[PDB]
Design a protein around this nucleic acid. Sequence first.
DNA 1: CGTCCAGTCTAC
DNA 2: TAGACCTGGACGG
Length: 265
Amino acid sequence: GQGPELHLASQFVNEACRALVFGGCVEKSSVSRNPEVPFESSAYRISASARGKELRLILSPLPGAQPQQEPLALVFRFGMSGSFQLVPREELPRHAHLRFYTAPPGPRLALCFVDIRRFGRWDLGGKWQPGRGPCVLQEYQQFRENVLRNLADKAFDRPICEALLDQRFFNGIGNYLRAEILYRLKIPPFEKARSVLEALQPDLLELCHSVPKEVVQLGGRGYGEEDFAAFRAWLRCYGMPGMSSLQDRHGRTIWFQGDPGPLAP
DNA sequence: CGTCCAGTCTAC
DNA sequence: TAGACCTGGACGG
């Protein structure tokens, strides 16, 4: 997922878990190479926040819960195929790698981290990844300043389409968002990043916020196949007929219209 | 059947 | 930088 999907997943966890109470341990599938979550409580609540391409779960025991346990935080990266589902406890999806089980009273549910390809990761810390820049959705002013104050960095020597995937400066931007952002300003994707940005100190850094915010305001992204059609209708550039495509230097497809730009392969 | 396609992470 | 990490759906023979 990209920023909008991480944000919608966190909203899903908060709304779906608002009136739920979890109990017992945190179950990992046997094939996941991610760490076991050392947590048990008779009664805990689950809440979430997103920052960029990361999601933080907080496991919060209720007053009196046993064993003695302090709130525990988990940070998830989704990779290519990560998501959260709330499912009936005996109808786990195929790739449910981490599960939180509702306590009784009511229907036994499992909140699941589901990840087909297992490119997703989680850490016990609760800390955001060091080196990831601020969230383009929730920390816009910090994100904007962190870019404009470090244009000398060699990251900005690269084509703008490659720079937009660098999570130290554009935390939350992925493949579809870089195409949609550049399409709206008709910036050639192989323009030098430093050239497009030096001329800024509604612009490119503004769209790094407002474009992904549009995806959030659609809602959906899992969180029927109606909001999947809603998304495909919103896309103007990524994968669309009449658009060009090239491989960047890491073999990721950039969709665009017209001029490929000077640093084109 | 087969090939090809859809975000980090790390060994060179 | 190139390869690794993985599964499944769309498509071709």
